[PDB]
Ligand binder design. Structure first.
Ligand SMILES: CC(=O)N[C@@H]1[C@@H](O)[C@H](O[C@@H]2O[C@H](CO)[C@H](O)[C@H](O)[C@H]2O[C@@H]2O[C@@H](C)[C@@H](O)[C@@H](O)[C@@H]2O)[C@@H](CO)O[C@H]1O
Ligand SMILES: [Ca+2]
Length: 141
C-alpha cells in the first residue's frame, strides 16, 4: 500500500468493471503490482463494451490528490486513449472529471487537488474497445 513512499488508498479496495475477458479481473489494478505485461497476471481486461469502464470504491468519502494510472505495456497500448477519469461522491454525483487523450509514456498522473470522493472511474469514450489497466494508484495529496 505504499508507492513512492506515499499511502496508496486504492490498494486492495473493492473494484468493479464493465465486464471481464481473459480473466482480467478488476482487482488486478489494485494489487500493488505495476507490471503491465498482460500475460504476467497484473493487468485488467474488459470485453469490448459500450463503453468499457473500471472503477475503484474507496468505501467512504476521502480526499483525492494524485491519481496515477499505469497502462498495459506488452501490446495494444493505444487502447488507453480518449478516456475520462471521473470522481463520484457517496451518492454517485459527479464531483470532478479529467479527460486524457493519450499517454506519452507507460503512465499518466492527474491531480484532483483534494476533491472529496468515494469512487474513481476510468471510462473509455470510444465504444467497442477493451479497457486494460496495469494499476491505478490514488493518493491523498
Ligand atoms: C498466455 C496465452 O497464451 N494467452 C493468450 C494470449 O497471449 C493471446 O494474446 C495475443 O497473443 C499474441 C501471441 O500469439 C500476442 O502476444 C498478442 O499481443 C496477443 O493479443 C492481445 O492480447 C490479448 C489478451 C487481447 O487483448 C487481444 O485483443 C490482444 O490483441 C490471446 C488472444 O489471442 O489469447 C490468449 O489465450
Ligand atoms: Ca496490477
Amino acid at each position: 500500500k505504499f508507492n513512492d513512499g506515499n499511502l496508496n488508498i486504492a490498494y486492495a479496495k473493492p473494484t468493479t468493471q464493465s465486464s471481464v475477458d481473459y480473466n482480467g479481473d478488476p482487482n488486478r489494478a489494485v494489487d500493488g503490482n505495476r507490471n503491465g505485461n498482460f500475460n504476467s497476471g497484473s493487468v485488467t481486461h474488459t470485453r469490448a463494451d459500450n463503453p468499457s469502464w473500471w472503477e475503484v470504491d474507496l468505501k467512504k468519502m476521502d480526499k483525492v490528490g494524485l491519481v496515477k494510472i499505469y497502462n498495459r505495456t506488452d501490446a495494444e497500448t493505444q487502447r488507453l486513449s480518449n478516456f475520462d477519469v471521473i470522481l463520484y461522491d457517496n451518492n454517485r454525483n459527479e464531483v470532478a472529471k479529467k479527460h486524457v487523450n493519450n499517454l506519452s509514456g507507460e503512465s499518466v498522473s492527474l491531480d484532483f487537488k483534494e476533491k472529496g470522493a468515494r469512487y474513481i472511474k476510468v471510462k473509455l469514450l470510444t465504444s467497442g474497445v477493451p479497457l486494460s489497466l496495469a494499476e491505478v494508484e490514488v493518493f491523498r495529496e
